[PDB]
Design an enzyme around this catalytic site. Structure first.
Site, PDB file in Angstrom:
ATOM      1  N   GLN A  80     -31.153 -27.754  80.559  1.00 27.06           N
ATOM      2  CA  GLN A  80     -30.496 -27.031  79.470  1.00 27.06           C
ATOM      3  C   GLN A  80     -31.075 -27.375  78.102  1.00 27.06           C
ATOM      4  OE1 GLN A  80     -27.129 -24.578  79.558  1.00 27.06           O
ATOM      5  NE2 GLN A  80     -29.084 -24.232  80.598  1.00 27.06           N
ATOM      6  N   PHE A  81     -32.155 -26.687  77.729  1.00 23.91           N
ATOM      7  CA  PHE A  81     -32.812 -26.895  76.441  1.00 23.91           C
ATOM      8  C   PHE A  81     -31.887 -26.562  75.264  1.00 23.91           C
ATOM      9  CE2 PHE A  81     -33.591 -22.374  76.990  1.00 23.91           C
ATOM     10  CZ  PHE A  81     -33.610 -21.866  75.694  1.00 23.91           C
ATOM     11  N   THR A  82     -30.889 -25.714  75.524  1.00 25.88           N
ATOM     12  CA  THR A  82     -29.914 -25.278  74.513  1.00 25.88           C
ATOM     13  C   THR A  82     -29.076 -26.425  73.929  1.00 25.88           C
ATOM     14  OG1 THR A  82     -28.312 -24.650  76.255  1.00 25.88           O
ATOM     15  CG2 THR A  82     -29.709 -22.891  75.362  1.00 25.88           C
TER      16      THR A  82
HETATM   17  N1  LIG Z   1     -37.928 -26.351  74.672  1.00 27.13           N
HETATM   18  C1  LIG Z   1     -37.778 -25.054  75.034  1.00 27.13           C
HETATM   19  N2  LIG Z   1     -37.646 -24.698  76.336  1.00 27.13           N
HETATM   20  C2  LIG Z   1     -37.495 -23.409  76.711  1.00 27.13           C
HETATM   21  N3  LIG Z   1     -37.465 -22.381  75.839  1.00 27.13           N
HETATM   22  C3  LIG Z   1     -37.586 -22.593  74.501  1.00 27.13           C
HETATM   23  C4  LIG Z   1     -37.753 -23.975  74.015  1.00 27.13           C
HETATM   24  N4  LIG Z   1     -37.847 -23.906  72.676  1.00 27.13           N
HETATM   25  C5  LIG Z   1     -37.752 -22.596  72.329  1.00 27.13           C
HETATM   26  N5  LIG Z   1     -37.590 -21.812  73.415  1.00 27.13           N
HETATM   27  C6  LIG Z   1     -37.461 -20.327  73.418  1.00 27.13           C
HETATM   28  O1  LIG Z   1     -38.647 -19.745  72.864  1.00 27.13           O
HETATM   29  C7  LIG Z   1     -38.339 -18.831  71.807  1.00 27.13           C
HETATM   30  C8  LIG Z   1     -39.185 -19.111  70.561  1.00 27.13           C
HETATM   31  O2  LIG Z   1     -39.183 -20.495  70.186  1.00 27.13           O
HETATM   32  P1  LIG Z   1     -40.478 -21.205  69.518  1.00 27.13           P
HETATM   33  O3  LIG Z   1     -41.666 -20.275  69.624  1.00 27.13           O
HETATM   34  O4  LIG Z   1     -40.596 -22.605  70.077  1.00 27.13           O
HETATM   35  O5  LIG Z   1     -40.086 -21.377  67.960  1.00 27.13           O
HETATM   36  P2  LIG Z   1     -39.718 -20.140  66.995  1.00 27.13           P
HETATM   37  O6  LIG Z   1     -38.357 -19.612  67.385  1.00 27.13           O
HETATM   38  O7  LIG Z   1     -39.571 -20.864  65.563  1.00 27.13           O
HETATM   39  O8  LIG Z   1     -40.898 -19.198  66.926  1.00 27.13           O
HETATM   40  C9  LIG Z   1     -36.840 -18.916  71.544  1.00 27.13           C
HETATM   41  O9  LIG Z   1     -36.261 -17.609  71.631  1.00 27.13           O
HETATM   42  C10 LIG Z   1     -36.267 -19.837  72.610  1.00 27.13           C
HETATM   43  O10 LIG Z   1     -35.366 -19.135  73.476  1.00 27.13           O
END
Ligand SMILES: Nc1ncnc2c1ncn2[C@@H]1O[C@H](COP(=O)(O)OP(=O)(O)O)[C@@H](O)[C@H]1O
Lengths: 152, 154
Positions: A80-82
């Site tokens: 759960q990354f959330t």
């Molecule tokens: N650690 C993670 N694990 C899985 N999914 C992620 C993670 N971090 C971000 N996300 C998903 O990726 C999408 C984009 O995040 P990211 O590209 O890391 O930064 P940003 O939102 O600033 O462009 C988000 O919609 C989120 O749902």
């Protein structure tokens, strides 16, 4: 590492096939596991030990007396990354404090191995990492426990 | 204050007295497991309500994390959860001394529920049975689990 631990009568885990069930437990714990970008193996070790040994079931006469292993119960571990959702800025969360998905999966996989090593390999159920999941949880109580290893 | 928020397609809350009885139920929305701390103030409670009602935890078309519970006319099931202040740093038997004592917790909880209804709508706010055993069938959507501790806020 962050974990939300819920005490369950059962949990049924499904993915989109409308839905097909891939995992199921009866009594035990669903553990929602957040992996921090800076998590070390000692952070993992702490969560595992706490999930397996926390005394969350009554044993009539006694409250908070038995753990999951004591009662031969099961654990479902869901990534759960959330749990690193940054909700301080506005109303749109970002999740930059969570471990990047590739190194998160490997770390998660190592955690599941150690869960199985410390308990029983039959008693540790999992989801589908990264994938959308439907999880029917029968909350028992409810009993919800939260642990963050950076408070240790 | 501490809250665990889960995105749901539904939640079904039962209490004791065939042996279980359903008292509350929601469809799409949030289950919010709320922990009240000893020294919680109305400002902590206000922060929790604002975030539960306004956090954009649903997709919308091409956009992720775009719509909140109110935007979609969705529901909230708010459940008191003292176990969130269960201290587990000293051994494996949880210690709950840091949770607001029941009588004071109940009045604070009911104030929180009243404010939720005021800020959203009465018919969209569901609760359980404070201080009673509950069986909650939750259909987790994602899942998406959010954790907020208002002590982290100033
Ligand atoms: N650690 C993670 N694990 C899985 N999914 C992620 C993670 N971090 C971000 N996300 C998903 O990726 C999408 C984009 O995040 P990211 O590209 O890391 O930064 P940003 O939102 O600033 O462009 C988000 O919609 C989120 O749902």
């Amino acid at each position: 590492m962050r974990v939300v631990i819920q005490r369950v009568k059962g949990a049924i885990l499904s993915v989109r096939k409308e839905l097909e069930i891939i995992s199921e437990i009866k009594n035990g714990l669903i553990c929602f596991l957040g992996i921090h970008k800076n998590d070390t193996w000692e952070d993992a070790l702490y969560i595992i030990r706490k999930c397996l040994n926390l005394r969350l079931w009554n044993n009539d006469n006694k409250t908070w007396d038995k753990n999951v292993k004591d009662l031969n119960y099961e654990l479902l571990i869901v990534s759960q990354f959330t749990l690193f959702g940054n909700t301080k800025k506005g109303n749109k969360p970002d999740f930059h404090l969570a471990k990047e998905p590739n190194e998160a999966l490997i770390f998660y996989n190592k955690i599941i191995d150690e869960f199985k090593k410390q308990y029983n390999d039959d008693k540790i159920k999992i989801g589908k990492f990264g994938n959308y999941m439907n999880i029917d949880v029968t909350n028992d109580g409810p009993v919800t426990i939260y642990i963050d290893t950076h408070d240790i």
